[PDB]
Structures are given as C-alpha cells and as structure tokens.
DNA sequence: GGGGTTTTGGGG
DNA sequence: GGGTTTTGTGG
DNA sequence: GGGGTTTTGGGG
C-alpha cells in the first residue's frame, strides 16, 4: 500500500524507470526534510526509516558557507537539514567498497542546496537502516539487473545452439569439460555484465574529506 | 580449584567472584557498544532456577569484553556454559550475574547434544563429552570432579527441554500481532525456506504457530546454522512498516537466531504442527512483478539431505576441485534467464535409439530436449549464463514439467501447459531447486519436478 | 591481589 | 543489563 | 609495564 519511507519510494521509482529522473513522479520532487545521523567520516541522513548518503556539489557547499557562515557541515550530526534543490542519478560502482550501494549499482541523491534547522528539531524514529540493505529494495535492484540481463541474453544468444543429444546419450566412453556449458550473456569487454540501457548520470561531487579540510585543515 | 554453585543458591550479599555451570536458553549476539566495549546478554537456567510457577524462570548473565572474539556465540538453546569469577547482584528483581571477561572472568561452552552446532555444520565428531567446543582465553581446564556436574546437568537439560517448552509464550510474540508492537520483540517460528539472496545474505521465510508468514535477512557468516524445516527462536526483531509487497522482519547487530537441542519439546511440536505455506507464491504468480521469491521445483525425497553446489563451483571448479571431481550427482539452485529452443513446440523431439539422433517432432520416439540458460547468486555479477539440460531420452527428468513428452505441434493441451511453464521459469524471482547428473561435460536435470 | 610476563620491584 | 558498532554484508 | 581494580604498595 502506502510507502512510509520517502527515500525508499524515491529510489525504487528511479530504478523502476531505468535511472531516468524525469520519469519519476513530480509529486515527489518536493523539499526533503531529513535528520542527520552521521557527518564524518560518512555523511548520512535519514527520512525516519532509512539512511542515504547525500552527494553535495561544489556549488551547494559554497552557497551554504555563504548563507550560513561558521556553521560547519561536518558537524551537523544529530541536527536536521532541508534539501530544497536535489536530483537523483544512477551510477555504476564497486559495492565491495561502497556500502551505500548494491550489486555494483548505486542511486545517488545529488544535493544542490540545503539549509540547517538547529531549532531543537526532534522526531521519535525507529533505528535507521541502510536502504541498500533493505530486502524489498535489494529485490528491486535485482529485478532491474534481471531485466537488463534477459534483454541482453535474448539479443546475444541465437540460433538454438543445443547440445547434440549424442554427446549425452552415449556418454559411456565420453569425457567432457564443464566449461563447455558456459555461454556469454552479452557483448561485453570484461568478466562483468555491463550491458545496461540506462545512461549513467555524471555530475561532479565533493569527497567528504575535502569538505572536512575546507573547514578544518 | 574451583567451587561451582547453583544459580538459586549463589550469594547476593557476598560480592565475591562465584563460578557456576548453567544451561543457556537465550542470548543476544555479541555486539559492540562503543569503541572499546563488547557485550553479550543471556538467560541461564539450572536445577534450582528454571521455572516460575509455569512460565520459565531464569537468571541473567552479562559478559563484558574488549574484543568480539572474547564473547560466546550462542547458536543453540539448551547447551551448557561454565563461568568463572562472576559477581552476582539483584537487577530489577532478577538475579544478574556479571563477568568482565576483559579482566579475570572466563567462560566455556559445552555441547548438550552429541555435537555442537559448528560440528554439525562441518560434520565433525566431538573430541570428547568433556571438551568445551568454545571458551574464552587461550586455555580451559576441566577437573575430574567437574565431569559429574557436566554429565548430570546435560541429563537435566534434556529432561527440562523435553518436558517443558522452556521458551514460554511470554518470551515471544505471535507473527500476526507483530505490527501491534511498539518496539522490538521475539519470535519462535519454523524455517520454511532459505533463499540465497546474494553472496553474503540469506533470506529466511518464516511461519509461526499463528500461521503468519514473514521474511527476514540473515547474513550467511553470522547465522550459518539456519536450515529449512527447523525451528528457531529469533531474539529481537522489529516489524518493517516500509515493506508493502511482503511481510518483513528487521534484525539488528545484537539480534540472534537460535535453534533448539534435539530433546526440545517445543521445537518438536512446532516442526510437526507448522506446515509449508505456498499462498504467498500462488498470489505472486498473478502479478507482473513479484518481490517475493518463488521456488518452482521440488527435489525427490531421497535427495532432501544432499548438500547444494553453486553454479560457480559446478562450471568453474568442477574440473579442478578434488571433492567435486569425485561426484557425478549434485544439487543446485538457480534462475532461468532463457530456454532453448525458443519455440516451445520444438521442446519435444523424436529420438532414434539406434542412431542417437533427434529430429523436429515432425517425426520420432518422443523425448524432451530442452536447454536452460541459468545463473545464480555465486555468478550474479559475471557476464556468463550457464547451460543446464533436460534431455529425457534415458529417463532423466522425464516428469519435470508434469507433462509427458508428446508432439507439441499436435497436442494443444501439452503445448499450452509447457508454454505457461516457460513464462513462469523465465519470470523474475522464479528459481529452480534441482538435482543434476554430470555426463560428458554437461549437467542433466533428474529426480526434479515442477510444483506449480 | 593476582595475570601474564619480565617488569623480576614498582605506576596510576 | 531488552541493546545501536563499522569491521559500514558476524561485530 | 600496564589493566583492572582497589591491592592504592608490593608477590611470584
């Protein structure tokens, strides 16, 4: 029924629309009011159910450091922030190194403008969990991959190259190598499947460490 | 020399280090609290403290340490723990035993059953009935006088678990009432299925006495003892209100999944009372997209105990690994990405027994010649798809589709049922559980059949 | 006081 | 102690 | 020597 988590609904719609942020519901592109769980070494914000890592543009931080002097970003822990201008992009990453992702795929929350509300901002919430560790969301990403995999295989595999029945019907004096059953899923370059149709968004972003040096050498 | 005292007889006044043997009936997983502190909370019982007048009564034990490795991992309820230098105090009416493992306290776990959990998983035999399967510090010593204590406590443990539920109705919440809880709660349910979501995670399909079904993520490394058809107690779960497509329980780093010793009356009754549910699967088959996994097949009873082999090992190591080379029959799980030949009508061909050749069923001895292209969790990220055959000319897998071979060009009934099965098999979140026989470098499905 | 350790008597 | 770390997919 | 723990300086 109704999805309580704003992030879960947002990210799920992004994946169900092939990473196209223009296809996601417009009634969801409103300002995001979220609590800051962590600020360093990882900046993580919650929506009352899950936590995601926001990616600030160099413009977003400069605009911040101007309208809100001395109020450091790497110290916003346990305080709320309001993201007025943001966008969502899909990126190919190494999940073994990025915990805010899954299956080498990540949905990024690009932040263009955000304001802090230190006004004793509260909200009794359940313990926030990594959206990319959620059962349903992981499944959504698996659906996404399965769809891309199936489309690539049905385009790559053709001619019905069936194993000759004789090779397995008279296997008394016949020996074979199991790797003969391996079939390429697509026209790739390496050992990883990468035949996706969504255009990987770019957009430059700041490393959480640079914003720490910019405020405290 | 150590003097062991019984739980109910331990001194609350003398804040001196005491030692005891006890049966563990509950425990959190060892968890970190800050940068230098780890903790494990458990409930313990013995001949003098085991039953409130009906509900199970118990003492508590809190172990403090500076390292994760210095705390006991309780995978099973009913095993025995031995503690040295514990301080007893009253905490909100209950007898609480505290032990700072990081200082001078120590613990040792003894298996109540023949083998410990880990020993059961790795099919190992216990060194002896007097050897701890786990303990703190570099060494553990058991004196001759301790043997009788251990042997008598085991006998008592089995009597206790076989004649009492031990985990009484006041220690867990019915799954169909989970949504009414304000916070976390406990659960007692049967594992109906263990689905390998990915490289590091299992998805448990649970069903308790209330008949409700719930899913929950279980890390492979953390809970390697989860097995289908077994009953477990889950310590600390929460209802996921963000899950709309299916009922999900959320676990925390301190949450724990505990099985029961063989003599457990509770586990025995639940194992028999709680029967498999396929309602979730049947309903999902009406949707274009199912966030719930559906295992479409069932393997012959005689293979139920056979361990599974991943596609990674089957196709990439089967010709190099010693263990895999000595085996010709394997059990594996996978999902079908594509089925060949494309035209379902050509799935059945005519076979000539003498020339070992098959032809379009525009002529021959009817058999199935289907080639599935599959993939699984172990090969999820690679750029491969694997061939798994269903060549029934010799009888292997003849009843897989629950449709006997026939000219699909003429028999409309058979063609339709096979076409419907095709769509189901290639559908997202559909999986196959099957046994295969290796022949001339290929794997042929056998003793496996669809259940939908 | 008592561990493990080496400090082998003596700090915080 | 019926709890909340990162080792951020045992902790 | 250094922890935890009180023994608060000193055993083996």
Output phi, psi for B402, to 5 deg: 60, 30
Place of tokens 């509770």: B266
Angle at A122 between CA A117 and CA A127, to 5 degrees: 115
What's the CA gap between B431 and B292, in Å, rounded?
11
Token pair of B282 as six digits: 């049947």
Q: Quick one: which of B292, B269, B270, B268 has its CA closest to B282? A: B292
B314 to chain A, any CB pair closer than 8 A? The answer is yes
Structure tokens at A72: 């450091």
Alpha helix locations (H) across chain A? 6-15, 58-67, 135-156, 166-169, 210-213
Q: Is B45 left (phi over 0), alpha (psi -120 to 50) or beta?
A: beta
Rounded CA-CA distance A37/A129 in Å is 11
Asked if residue B30 lies in contact with residue B37, where contact means CB atoms within 8 angstroms, the answer is no
**How far apart are alpha carbons B343 and B379 in whole angstroms?**
27
Name the experiment that determined this structure: X-ray
Documented resolution in Å: 2.1
How many other CB atoms sit within 10 Å of the CB of residue A55?
Answer: 23
Name the 3-class secondary structure at B279: helix
d(CA B193, CA B296) in angstroms, rounded, equals 13
CA distances from B331 to A175, B191, B296, B368, B438 (A): 21, 20, 15, 21, 11
- Answer whether the bond into residue B280 is a cis peptide, omega within 30°: no
CA distance B283 to B307: 30
For B51, which DSSP code? B
Could you give the angle at which helices B265-273 and B144-163 cross, rounded to 10 degrees? 40
The beta strand positions in A99-195, using DSSP E, are 105-117, 129-130, 182-184
CA dist., res. B234 & res. B256, Å (int)? 6
Determine contact: A120 vs chain B, CB below 8 A.
Answer: no
Write out chain B residues lying below 8 Å of A145, CB-based. Answer: 380
Closest by alpha carbon to A98, among A139, A68, A131, A69? A131
Q: Which CATH superfamily is domain B172-287 in?
A: Nucleic acid-binding proteins (2.40.50.140)
Neighbouring C-beta atoms of residue B286, cutoff 10 Å? 7
Helix axis angle, A135-156 relative to A6-15, nearest 10°?
0
Alpha carbons B447 and B120: distance in angstroms, whole number: 27
Specify whether the CB–CB gap between A105 and A141 falls below 8 A: yes
Residue B66 CB in 7 A reach of strand E: yes
Do B387 and A185 make contact, defined as CB atoms within 8 angstroms? no
Q: What ranges do the domains of chain B cover?
A: 3-171, 172-287, 288-452
List the one residue out of B148, B114, B115 whose CA is nearest residue B21.
B148
Tokens of B86: 């514990």
Chain B residues 185-214 with Cβ under 7 Å of strand D are 185-186, 198, 200-201
How far is Cα B60 from Cα B88, in angstroms, rounded to an integer?
Answer: 10
State the pairing for strand pair B348-352/B134-135: unpaired
Using CA atoms, how far apart are residues B445 and B329, in angstroms rounded to an integer?
10
Homologous superfamily assigned to B3-171: Nucleic acid-binding proteins (2.40.50.140)
Angstrom distances, CA of residue A26 to CA of A10, A21, A31:
11, 10, 12
> b/e map of B315-326 (b: 16 or more CB within 10 Å)?
bbebeeeeebee
Would you say B294 and B277 are in contact if contact means Cβ atoms under 8 Å apart?
no
List the one residue out of B77, B90, B82 whose CA is nearest residue B172.
Answer: B77
CA distance B125 to B130: 13
Residue B314 has a CB neighbour count (10 Å cut-off) of 25
Joined together, the tokens standing for residue B234 give: 């889950």
Task: Concatenate the DSSP letters of all residues of B89-101 into one string.
Answer: EEETTEEEEEEET
B41 vs B81: CA distance, rounded Å: 13
| Within this chain, domains B3-171 and B288-452 share the same CATH topology | yes
List Cβ neighbours of B210 (8 Å cut-off, separation of 6 or more). B174, B175, B176, B177
DSSP B397: T
Label the pairing between strands B357-360 and B348-352: antiparallel
Residues 20-59 of A with CB under 7 A from strand D: 38, 41-42, 44, 51
CATH class of segment(s) B288-452:
mainly beta
Residues facing residue B99 across a β-bridge: B63
**Residue B173 to residue B233: CA distance in whole angstroms:** 11
Task: Note which residues in 155-184 of chain A have CB less than 8 A from chain B.
Answer: 157, 160-163, 165-171, 174-184
Look at strands A80-92 and A54-56 and give their pairing. unpaired
Structural domains of chain A, with CATH: 1-217 (2.40.200.10)
């Amino acid at each position: 029924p109704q999805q309580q988590s704003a992030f879960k609904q947002l990210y799920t719609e992004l994946f169900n629309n092939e990473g196209d942020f223009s296809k996601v519901s417009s009634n969801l592109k409103k300002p995001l009011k979220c609590y800051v769980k962590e600020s360093y070494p990882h900046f993580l914000v919650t929506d009352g159910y899950f936590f995601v890592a926001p990616y600030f543009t160099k413009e977003a931080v400069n605009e911040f450091h101007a309208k809100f002097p001395n109020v450091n970003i790497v110290d916003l822990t346990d305080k709320v922030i309001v993201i007025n201008n943001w966008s969502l992009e899909l990126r190919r990453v190494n999940s073994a190194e990025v915990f805010t992702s899954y299956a080498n795929l990540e949905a990024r929350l690009i932040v263009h403008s955000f304001k802090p509300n230190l006004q004793e901002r509260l909200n009794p919430t359940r313990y926030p969990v990594n959206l990319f560790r959620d059962d349903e969301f992981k499944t959504t990403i698996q659906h996404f991959r399965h769809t891309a995999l199936q489309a690539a295989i049905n385009k790559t595999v053709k001619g019905d190259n069936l194993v000759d029945i004789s090779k397995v019907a008279d296997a008394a004096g016949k020996k074979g190598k199991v790797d003969a059953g391996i079939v390429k899923a697509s026209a790739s370059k390496g050992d990883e499947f990468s035949d996706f149709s969504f255009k990987e968004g770019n957009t430059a972003t700041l490393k959480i460490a640079d914003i720490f040096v910019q405020e405290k050498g | 020399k150590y003097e062991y005292v019984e739980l109910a007889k331990a001194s609350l006044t003398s804040a001196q280090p005491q030692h005891f043997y006890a049966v563990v009936i509950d425990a959190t997983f060892p968890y970190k609290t800050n940068q230098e502190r780890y903790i494990c909370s458990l409930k313990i019982v013995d001949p003098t403290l085991y039953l409130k007048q009906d509900a199970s009564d118990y003492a508590t034990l809190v172990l403090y340490a500076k390292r994760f490795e210095d705390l006991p991992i309780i995978h099973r309820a009913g095993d025995i723990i031995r503690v040295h230098r514990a301080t007893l105090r009253l905490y909100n009416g209950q007898r609480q035993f505290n032990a700072n493992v990081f200082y001078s306290s120590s613990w040792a776990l003894f298996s109540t059953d023949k083998r410990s959990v880990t020993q059961e998983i790795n099919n190992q035999d216990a060194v002896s009935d007097t050897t701890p399967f786990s303990f703190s510090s570099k060494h553990a010593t058991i004196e001759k006088n301790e043997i009788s204590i251990l042997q008598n406590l085991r006998k008592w443990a089995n009597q206790y678990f076989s004649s009492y539920s031990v985990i009484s109705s006041d220690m867990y919440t019915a799954l169909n009432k989970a949504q009414a809880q304000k916070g976390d709660f406990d659960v007692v349910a049967k594992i109906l299925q263990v689905h390998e979501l990915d490289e590091y995670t299992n998805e448990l399909k649970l069903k308790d006495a209330s008949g409700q079904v719930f899913y929950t993520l279980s890390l492979k490394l953390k809970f390697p003892h989860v097995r289908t058809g077994e009953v477990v107690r889950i310590r600390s779960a929460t209802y996921d209100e963000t899950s709309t497509q299916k009922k999900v329980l959320i676990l925390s780093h301190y949450s724990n999944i505990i099985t029961f010793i063989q003599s457990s009356k509770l586990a025995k009754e639940l194992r028999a009372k709680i029967q498999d549910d396929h309602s979730v699967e049947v309903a999902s088959l009406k949707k274009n997209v199912s966030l719930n996994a559906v295992v479409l097949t069932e393997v012959d009873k005689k293979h139920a105990a056979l361990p599974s082999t991943s596609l990674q090992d089957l196709f990439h190591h089967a010709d190099s690994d010693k263990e895999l080379q000595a085996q010709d029959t394997f059990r594996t799980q996978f999902y079908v990405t594509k089925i060949e030949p494309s035209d379902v009508k050509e799935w059945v061909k005519g076979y000539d027994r003498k020339t070992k050749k098959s032809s379009s069923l525009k002529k021959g001895d009817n058999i199935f010649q289907v080639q599935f292209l599959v993939k699984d969790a172990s090969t999820q990220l690679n750029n491969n798809t694997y061939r798994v055959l269903l060549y029934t000319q010799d009888g292997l897998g003849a009843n897989f589709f629950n449709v006997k071979a026939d000219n699909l060009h003429k028999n409309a009934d058979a063609r339709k049922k096979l076409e419907d099965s095709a769509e189901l098999l290639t559908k997202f979140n559909s999986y196959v559980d099957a046994v295969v026989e290796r022949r001339n470098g290929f794997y042929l499905i056998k003793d496996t059949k669809l259940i939908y």
